[PDB]
């Protein structure tokens, strides 16, 4: 695809959200799209920046042998774009691959950086790399674009990106072997792939938390989620 | 900007709206950004497609010597992306340049085509060329993207792109020499660069049209727009 300008004409330079395909996840379906690879080298991308979005993820995964399946921990700066909520998810199943590569072309991005591979810790909004822009639009368009978007940010991200959780439990891995318990305040609940996004779970942190709660301190709650319970 | 993939890696391929910089026009300010050029050759771009937008323009311009300042009339297909409203604008001032080139990098686009130059007739949404996309996203993302966006179009464009006008009168040209009378039903009104977009003008086609109207058929109305009249 050389066209006339592919050779050296300037291109700029931000990540775009994959959710434009109507994509949403129950959590494991996101990992369904990635898994791990393979001893093939990792690749990275340099950006001017990337898109803010309501849905992103923080990760740590473990191996039963104590390795524990860690994704690489790169020396790149690890701040990331605002995201209304993120889901930290953690624990085994194991990484047979030596890294958590995307299968979708889903670059994982933070701090104007992205990669073909998921790294330990900081959030990975997923996306594709924009290329285009008049070379001088940087003094104009970029004032609202993510490079200066913090300048034009509203105060509503305080109700926005602030509203997040880290409590998912990734038991097992792959489509034939995993479960996602959700912790609250050392309480757990049966995974609900038929429900999405922590606002729902927040009700559990305001209702079943209010009653049907772990008044019994013998252990973390394991709420039994009956489909009737899910319904009501 | 060769990077690693500028050379031949596939890029795809749609126009994006320039209004993302908060841009809006009173009509002449749009032409302020373009004017004409110059005997330099015109350039074109091939796209998969481009963005639907609320604001676009149709043009014909004239020379006082009867030439009349026509923009080239290309043999490319001349359909264009839906646009909520467009402003056809027409008449002299003259084209000293042999074509109506943008000064902003404002590609003028219709039918998955765009150019550095404005052409006669069909609407020119203005924009920049996106480049990116996984080569297989065409079977997924593109179903909602402008290539198949007509499939996923809602019925609301009937209240949308249908709501447009062709009545602007471009008297004179350039920032030191032009005026924009607005016709309605063979009525005219004094230009209002302090007001934008035909919905305002629609009130005139429903109110001053109802009374203060050209009951006198001696000629087209030339409403005198007092700033008090503009205010009330």
């Amino acid at each position, epitope marked *: 695809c050389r066209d006339k300008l592919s050779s050296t004409n300037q291109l700029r330079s931000v990540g775009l959200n994959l959710e434009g395909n109507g994509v949403a996840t129950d959590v494991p379906s996101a990992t*369904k799209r990635w898994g791990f*690879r393979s001893g093939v*080298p990792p690749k990275v991308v340099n950006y001017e920046a990337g898109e803010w979005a309501e849905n992103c993820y923080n990760l740590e995964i473990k191996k039963p042998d104590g390795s524990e399946c860690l994704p690489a921990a790169p020396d790149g700066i690890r701040g990331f774009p605002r995201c209304r909520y993120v889901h930290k998810v953690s624990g085994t199943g194991p990484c047979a691959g030596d890294f958590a590569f995307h*299968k979708e072309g889903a670059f994982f991005l933070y701090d104007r950086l992205a990669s*073909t591979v998921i790294y330990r810790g900081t959030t990975f909004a997923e996306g594709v790399v924009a290329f285009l822009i008049l070379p001088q639009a940087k003094k104009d368009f970029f004032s609202s674009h993510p490079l200066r978007e913090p300048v034009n940010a509203t105060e509503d991200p305080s109700s926005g990106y602030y509203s997040t959780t880290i409590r998912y439990q990734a038991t097992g891995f792959g489509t034939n072997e995993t479960e996602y318990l959700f912790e609250v305040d050392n309480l757990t609940y049966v995974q609900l792939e038929s429900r999405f996004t922590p606002q729902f779970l927040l009700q559990l942190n305001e209702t079943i938390y209010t009653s049907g709660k772990r008044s019994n301190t013998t252990g973390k709650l394991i709420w039994k989620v009956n489909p009737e319970i899910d319904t009501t | 900007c060769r990077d690693k993939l500028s050379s031949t*890696n596939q890029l795809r391929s749609v126009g994006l709206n320039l209004e993302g910089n908060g841009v809006a026009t009173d009509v002449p300010s749009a032409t302020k950004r373009w004017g004409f050029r110059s005997g330099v050759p015109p350039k074109v771009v091939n796209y998969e497609a481009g963005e639907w937008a609320e604001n676009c323009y149709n043009l014909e311009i004239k020379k006082p010597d009867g030439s009349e300042c026509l923009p080239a009339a290309p043999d490319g297909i001349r359909g264009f992306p839906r646009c909520r409203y467009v402003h056809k604008v027409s008449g002299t001032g003259p084209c000293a340049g042999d074509f109506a080139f943008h000064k902003e990098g404002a590609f003028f686009l219709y039918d998955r085509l765009a150019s550095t130059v404005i052409y006669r007739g069909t609407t020119f949404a203005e924009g920049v060329v996106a480049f990116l996309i996984l080569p*297989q996203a065409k079977k997924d993302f593109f179903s909602s993207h402008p290539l198949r966006e007509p499939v996923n179009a809602t019925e609301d464009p009937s209240s949308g792109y249908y709501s447009t006008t062709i009545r602007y009168q471009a008297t004179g040209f350039g920032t030191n020499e032009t005026e924009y009378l607005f016709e309605v039903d063979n009525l005219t009104y004094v230009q209002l660069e302090s007001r934008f977009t035909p919905q305002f003008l629609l009130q005139l086609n429903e109110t001053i049209y109802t009374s203060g109207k050209r009951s006198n058929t001696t000629g087209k109305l030339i409403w005198k727009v007092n700033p008090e009249i503009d205010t009330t």
Partner: antibody
Amino acid sequence: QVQLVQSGAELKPPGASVKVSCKPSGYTFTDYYIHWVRQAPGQGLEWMGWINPKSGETHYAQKFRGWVTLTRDTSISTTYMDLTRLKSDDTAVYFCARGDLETTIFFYNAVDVWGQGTLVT
Amino acid sequence: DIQMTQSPSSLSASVGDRVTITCRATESIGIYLNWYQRKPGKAPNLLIFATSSLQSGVPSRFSGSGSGTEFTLTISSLQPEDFATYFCQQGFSSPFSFGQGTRLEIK
């Protein structure tokens, strides 16, 4: 036009080394991934792993036997699939497929541009 | 170690025939795999890009797509060069196993 020219076949007599040349032409010497595939006659291809000629890294599948490393002089047009512990109990025809170095890896397993091959017995 | 199962087993064929070939991953992948074909006595040629796009210089007759564990090559209007053996290379991961399957013959 890439042409990964390659060494002639030889009978074994086990314990042999046998470097296998894969000399490109029509190509900048270090700009694509180099292979490294082999098969027994009568058998489907075995991946051998691959090498990144820009840095010489092994990647890494035949290290399981440990039989192969490559000589990679960057001032010459070829590399050698250096072999060790070669045995006549595993005959094969070696081949040199070509990858796409200096790109994001969306691969696209290497094309078997070459071809020819080196039988060993 | 996802095996690249492939079927149909080799088939009789004639010119103008339309056929399909499929690969079965040992595990679902949802990611690209590539196909090759070869003249007897020759190295395989890439036939289709791993993303189910034809390799450059491949005839329009060639086709095919897939997802999950299933990937299906298609060919329409067979021509004498199409009796080449077809394959299912692993594509996306290590070890990069190579599937084997039908080739065409007439007798």
